[PDB]
Design a protein around this ligand. Structure first.
Ligand SMILES: CO[C@H]1CC[C@H](C(=O)Nc2cc(-c3ccnc(Nc4ccc(F)cc4)c3)ccn2)CC1
Length: 335
């Protein structure tokens, strides 16, 4: 009459409530798909294994659990259930997060040919979500395809809340650590959009060094005044990098790559390029804001004041010993 049972999912041991049935490996913390017999709907279940095991695993977990439990928007994850099989703070090991299941992760979507209604819709949804987080002072700073999911009917959700390991989608200000505002997530959005057109990661980099080489090798060296905002040592590295005027957007995202047989298709293809050309701007002082990107004629066909302007959702990251976490996380799981 103990409510839990154990199975192997892919590899690891899942100990979940009896309600979740027919667990299937979909991800690897270690995520899987299940039928929730109570709700009668499909679900994704995520195993967090000893999440108090270090400051990295811990902060991420505590942040993402407080955060998950007060953000309420159709384009960010709606947590359906949190539970631990362990009975006592003494025996506590794992946390299981549960949300409803989508048909695709955004990496599979990037790999196909999107028409503009769809591509435009995803990017719209990404912005609505991003717009929600920003209104609770949450600046994500690490949007990536693997943490976005999608329904067959084209509805999109963002799974995570970002930086306090895929670095391709991180903004210039992140890569060189310089201080950001909300549109830092506009870089990342545009890197996703860019990849939807190109079906190639825009900036495939070994490290922050290799990545930066790849940004400028295409968009060009940032102008004088951007550099004048970098900390003396980083500014000095950046300044003695080989210069580049870099390709223009028609050259970066040619006509070859676009649906362009209908006149609609032709008209929209140039609207995407325009929008991309505004998102993928290195200097954040020159890069489009989340409110402008929604007034762009590519996106704005979807504009919905209910979606775009939703009511906004203690102060987080702080130092704790890997025992004080065990308890902090455990209290959050028991509510
Ligand atoms: C073979 O798999 C198919 C069927 C569906 C499949 C798919 O991945 N569907 C799908 C996957 C997730 C998912 C993926 C990776 N990580 C998390 N983390 C997570 C965070 C919080 C939380 F509460 C729960 C989990 C959730 C969510 C919804 N739907 C794509 C292809």
């Amino acid at each position: 009459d103990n409510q839990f049972y154990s199975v192997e999912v892919g590899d690891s041991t899942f100990t979940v409530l009896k309600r979740y049935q027919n667990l299937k490996p979909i991800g690897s913390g270690i995520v899987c798909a299940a039928y929730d017999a109570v709700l009668d709907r499909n679900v994704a279940i995520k195993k967090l294994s000893r999440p108090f095991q270090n400051q990295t695993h811990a902060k991420r977990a505590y942040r993402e659990l407080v955060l998950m439990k007060c953000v309420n928007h159709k384009n960010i994850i709606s947590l359906l259930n949190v539970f631990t099989p362990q009975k006592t703070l003494e025996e506590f090991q794992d946390v299981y997060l549960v949300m409803e299941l989508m048909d695709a992760n955004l990496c599979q979507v990037i790999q196909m040919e999107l028409d503009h209604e769809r591509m435009s819709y995803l990017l719209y949804q990404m912005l609505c979500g991003i717009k929600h987080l920003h209104s609770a002072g949450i600046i994500h700073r690490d949007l990536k395809p693997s943490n976005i999911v999608v329904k067959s009917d084209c509805t999109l959700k963002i799974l995570d809340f970002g930086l306090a390991v895929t670095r391709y989608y991180r903004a210039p200000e992140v890569i060189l650590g310089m201080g950001y505002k909300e549109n830092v997530d506009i870089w990342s959005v545009g890197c996703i959009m860019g990849e939807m057109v190109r079906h190639k990661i825009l900036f495939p980099g070994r490290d922050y060094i290799d990545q930066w080489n790849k940004v400028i090798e295409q968009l060009g060296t940032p102008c004088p005044e951007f550099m004048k905002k970098l900390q003396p040592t980083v500014r000095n590295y950046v300044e003695n990098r080989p210069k580049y005027a870099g390709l223009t957007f028609p050259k970066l995202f040619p006509d070859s790559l676009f649906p362009a047989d209908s006149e609609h298709n032709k008209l929209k293809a140039s609207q995407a390029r325009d929008l991309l050309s505004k998102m993928l701007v290195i200097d954040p002082a020159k890069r489009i804001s989340v409110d402008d990107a929604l007034q762009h004629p590519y996106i704005n066909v979807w504009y919905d004041p209910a979606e775009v302007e939703a009511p906004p959702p203690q102060l987080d990251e702080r130092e704790h010993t890997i025992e004080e976490w065990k308890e902090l996380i455990y209290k959050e799981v028991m509510n």
